[PDB]
Symmetry: D2
Subunit: 337 residues, 4 copies
Amino acid sequence: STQVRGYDFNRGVNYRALLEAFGTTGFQATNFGRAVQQVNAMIEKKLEPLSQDEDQHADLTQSRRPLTSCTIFLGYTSNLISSGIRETIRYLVQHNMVDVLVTTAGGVEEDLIKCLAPTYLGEFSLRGKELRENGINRIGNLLVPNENYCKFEDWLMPILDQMVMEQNTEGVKWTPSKMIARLGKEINNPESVYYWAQKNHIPVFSPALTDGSLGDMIFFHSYKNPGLVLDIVEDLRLINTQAIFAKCTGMIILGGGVVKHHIANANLMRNGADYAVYINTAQEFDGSDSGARPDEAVSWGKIRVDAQPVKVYADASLVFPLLVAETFAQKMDAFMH
Amino acid sequence: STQVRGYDFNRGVNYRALLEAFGTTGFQATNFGRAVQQVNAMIEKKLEPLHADLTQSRRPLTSCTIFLGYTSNLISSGIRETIRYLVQHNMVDVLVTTAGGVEEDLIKCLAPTYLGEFSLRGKELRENGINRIGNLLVPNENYCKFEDWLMPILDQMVMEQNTEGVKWTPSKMIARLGKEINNPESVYYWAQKNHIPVFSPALTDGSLGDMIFFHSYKNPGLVLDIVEDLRLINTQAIFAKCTGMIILGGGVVKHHIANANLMRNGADYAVYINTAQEFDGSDSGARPDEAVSWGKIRVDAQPVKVYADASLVFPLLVAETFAQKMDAFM
Amino acid sequence: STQVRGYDFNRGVNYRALLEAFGTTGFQATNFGRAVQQVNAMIEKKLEPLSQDEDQHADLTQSRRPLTSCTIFLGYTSNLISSGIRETIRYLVQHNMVDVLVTTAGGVEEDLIKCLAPTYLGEFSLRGKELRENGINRIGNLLVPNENYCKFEDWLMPILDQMVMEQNTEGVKWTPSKMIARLGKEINNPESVYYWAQKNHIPVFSPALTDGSLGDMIFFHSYKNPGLVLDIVEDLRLINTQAIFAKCTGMIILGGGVVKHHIANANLMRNGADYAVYINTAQEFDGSDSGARPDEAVSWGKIRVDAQPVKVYADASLVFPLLVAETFAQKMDAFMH
Amino acid sequence: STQVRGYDFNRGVNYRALLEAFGTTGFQATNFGRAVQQVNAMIEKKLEPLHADLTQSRRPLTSCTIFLGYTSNLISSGIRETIRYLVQHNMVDVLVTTAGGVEEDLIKCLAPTYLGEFSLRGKELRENGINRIGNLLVPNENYCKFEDWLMPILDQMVMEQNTEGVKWTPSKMIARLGKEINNPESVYYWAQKNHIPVFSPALTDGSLGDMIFFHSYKNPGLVLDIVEDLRLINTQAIFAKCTGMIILGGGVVKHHIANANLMRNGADYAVYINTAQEFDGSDSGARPDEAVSWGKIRVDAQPVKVYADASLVFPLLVAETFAQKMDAFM
Ligand SMILES: NC(=O)c1ccc[n+]([C@@H]2O[C@H](COP(=O)([O-])OP(=O)(O)OC[C@H]3O[C@@H](n4cnc5c(N)ncnc54)[C@H](O)[C@@H]3O)[C@@H](O)[C@H]2O)c1
Ligand SMILES: NC(=O)c1ccc[n+]([C@@H]2O[C@H](COP(=O)([O-])OP(=O)(O)OC[C@H]3O[C@@H](n4cnc5c(N)ncnc54)[C@H](O)[C@@H]3O)[C@@H](O)[C@H]2O)c1
Ligand SMILES: NC(=O)c1ccc[n+]([C@@H]2O[C@H](COP(=O)([O-])OP(=O)(O)OC[C@H]3O[C@@H](n4cnc5c(N)ncnc54)[C@H](O)[C@@H]3O)[C@@H](O)[C@H]2O)c1
Ligand SMILES: NC(=O)c1ccc[n+]([C@@H]2O[C@H](COP(=O)([O-])OP(=O)(O)OC[C@H]3O[C@@H](n4cnc5c(N)ncnc54)[C@H](O)[C@@H]3O)[C@@H](O)[C@H]2O)c1
């Protein structure tokens, strides 16, 4: 039995020992320590060699991405890409540390737009009327000028032209994940999550890709250049197959909604994820999927019964960079060369 | 200036007077009274006397186009009946829900959902083939019945796509499933009967997705396009005379309605009931004033958010609004 | 097994049937139905006659309040007295429907001040600087003018003078509950909770009575008329004895903090309350007593193991008048004559 | 205008740089960086070079009087050590906590608290004599040890009241208990040694209350007066040169500090870390701008609230503030 004890600053500021002390500090600090242990267990599993029998069963996807002993799904809500967690996610993707991304439409487009123009710090309480009068859009305590989206429109419209031509003359059947790969290739910028995702053959799923500025642009585009089709059915096969043919899976989910359920539902197709860490601020009392505890997912088979899932009830803008510092970033050498 | 004063139970129990008194009780009771006022303003606008080629829709235009959105779990709840009533009587014009909010309305025509508790342990539920949704319970067998019912319909859909030129989208699929369920307890039976479109751009994220997925290995090729559905919802906003938004919960269902209304530079009326909070920067938790900065809500509008579980507040809101003006819809 | 089914408005607006349908609607509506059942079980117990053996054991307090088969503790946070729930609480107290009140200092003083000047509706977002510049204090979306407290000061200072004289020349040993009874007698106004509480011999406990405007006034008073003593130890004996010698107890607690723990801790002295209904918006993840689920209280013995406690996660300004409508208000005839 | 940008792990792991980057990461990470700035401004003010009869206190005045408040459960947590460190080094001037936040610091000198889980069932815990606090566990035997330790001290207190004229209050009792526990792991041992007063106006609401209650039937007559303690805390604010408030959690501990600062027309600096939200009208959930309307915070101050569990954020805040300026306290 482990005793409660906080970090003793009479020892000075030993930042690694201070982070390790979250485990015995209690409440959500203890859940953070548990989440570090779970993520490190996913990484240790991922780095374990595939046996010949395992290699066979998991080679049954024709994905150009080499298979590992643990397929890690990373999900995050759109606002976390508006935040500086965009940099944290880009790092993991750049170094092949996760295998599948799931995000909503804002989580795609704002990564691309940040390569064209920055997002600024503001405050939650700024009044919408005066903001609108000055052409400034608010995302929490962040601020995106209208001109950011104009730049986006000028960048994106020629690409949508090529996509429709390739659809109509080369037989391409677009889906959200294929479009996201193409946009990451086009942005051609190492600061972009989606640039690294397509470079590293990491598929990105986003079934409601029309729900944001990218949809605005497709909509306007469709009046000049009609007929672009985005099929979500093929993308459902594609994400589900990533789970079905995995040796092991881990889920790391920041926030709730479509991103959380879509990853969990893919893992239900294999009778459950082996490891699961949730960081989100939602609560269960309203019945929502977003606020459901991991144990709700156990009843469905989204998480295996012998898994030890962890939820940290906190804003991921605080927790996720600390989690990455104590896990993936310490095993970085294993992910390179 | 309005004084704070609660309902006086020395009057006895007049429930209408009791609900009216929420307005002067303060905190979220006061926001509830403001929400009643805003929804009654949408209805009164809708009822004022007064396109199909530009919206590609058969639904006639009224003086206020009302968009109703709700998360999936509210269809698991008994709020399913509240929503079905509004759709049955043609009181709203556009529905947005996520996939669970489509499929569980259909499954409830085949088998019931049951009351349970939030604390029931997942291992024992899983061993007994029972799935938990909050404090509700759905036996596995409900999804078996759903599968049996759905597979021949998916067969017809693929046949119609490949030989009759049908280009399926979520809203077109949802209309077809409501027609097929053919049951007056179903929200989507009434929506298609009354030509109320239902948008659900991630319709694959749930059990209908599972079923489409399994079905595709037996009968391949169904496609669901989300682009045409984006044109259909956006033009519902663009060509409206006025618009109101009533949004239960957060996520895709809230943003998708607000973004359609951004296309007309903003909704005229807006009422939110949701439990999310702003501090995590989320769109779900954003106050209505964030949407004003984007132009999703007009600067002159008077939007209202009630911070509460909609399973408590939405039946009361409907009692004091739509259900009072039933003669006009009738 | 009970099926989920909401109220069907094709039946018209039958408000009683609509409230009854919360029970099968799910999420917090179902918890509301459960809370109605629990409160009605407290009332049904309270109205059951005392047997001679029970009458004996419970007559062992020298309280002038006649003993019943279920002693009900009603607790509420200060802001709920700023709200119109003040009227709901006054009704229950006026008709002897509950037996012990617990509230914090704002929950005492603002009931008295509402007899001198009203509280007004405002908005949460009004800016503090301009409010302060206009002498208006904000409580959530409510507004209290400075002049309300001036009126309070003019009303209260003569009473504090008498209290010190009675302490120093008549041997009175003041405690929060004795002071609250005296203030309710002095306000002499049927709109006041504390007026009815002292009329009906319902004790009010508030151990941190100095934490608010009443404390401000005692503080200033003490420089002109020193030495007023408020003992909290005697009041601890007094609340605890209400629980120890009860036949049965019920707890109805609106909100968290001192009010919730102080009632629960009194019931721990009898190895637990028989019935418990909580209405509060706090959540458990931060470890707080305020956000603790009823089941945490079971581990201590604050709630009996065979009790069926209920928590409704909601703002009590919405829920509590509905709860009272479906419970105490329907049994009003039993509480009169 | 500051651009949004997260820490770049291609730099490797420099934890100081990682914490600095919270400022430009957004949402509550940005509020954390603002909280570091405000606490460092209080400390820098306190360290500027520069009554006992009017405050009735032996503690010398500095250029910034800092009030630290925390709820009881944070002393159940390992934040007890963080708080003990600040008090041990005389870094804050006034403590406010509720009764659990006094007694569990003393009990931890007698027996440990253990890690558990939130979901552990109360019936089985109760059958095993284990009490739950969030995901922490306190065996009944800890309170037996507390009783044995406390009873002879309560005896001395009653004797001193009745024959040496002592007029006990919560703060005077807490000072005596810290002296008696005589253990350098204890917050309150350090507070009395360093003449930092601790205010707790509902000190009866917890296990020390239970013990006082039982003790009074064996040795009657102890009185705890809260009026003199109100004069003592209020005069700490009134005669300060400047004040800052650092408040972990909500309830009595937050209001009691803010109300003392209302007496001087408002604190100069204020940092809140709490999980409560405003919508229910509560004082716990009130934003700092509500306190500005009352005059509890000066209109020119720049207060900061971080919406987060303090068990995560407070050790990081101390790392970047007080623990960096340790040489000046030393
Ligand atoms: N920047 C934007 O927010 C933005 C921009 C474009 C479009 N959209 C659209 O809005 C819709 C809804 O957005 P969404 O589903 O991505 O999520 P969301 O923003 O609605 O958040 C869903 C839930 O995730 C959790 N969450 C959010 N932020 C968190 C954080 N910082 N830490 C921990 N938990 C957190 C909360 O419980 C929240 O209620 C999407 O379809 C999206 O495309 C949003
Ligand atoms: N939960 C289910 O029943 C279920 C079933 C199948 C599929 N799914 C899938 O889960 C994904 C996410 O579900 P979602 O987007 O519909 O919402 P969600 O359930 O994730 O809720 C999102 C937010 O809505 C607000 N909300 C939820 N319930 C509320 C209530 N009772 N009252 C007020 N506000 C409330 C809360 O802030 C919540 O965080 C969807 O893609 C969905 O198809 C869910
Ligand atoms: N009007 C005021 O708020 C006021 C005025 C004078 C003094 N004070 C002092 O402030 C201190 C703290 O106040 P408190 O302990 O009474 O509580 P609080 O206002 O701090 O609330 C405590 C918790 O109770 C719950 N709660 C609050 N309002 C609720 C509601 N409407 N519905 C459901 N749950 C709700 C929430 O979880 C909240 O965090 C007290 O000592 C009090 O005397 C406050
Ligand atoms: N909980 C215990 O360990 C315990 C033990 C004995 C007695 N009690 C008694 O319970 C009563 C109420 O306790 P309380 O007033 O100290 O506070 P509480 O625990 O009731 O918390 C009040 C509010 O503080 C905020 N808060 C709590 N923990 C937080 C965290 N980890 N991070 C950020 N914010 C947080 C939350 O909004 C919470 O609703 C007191 O009178 C106390 O003496 C509690």
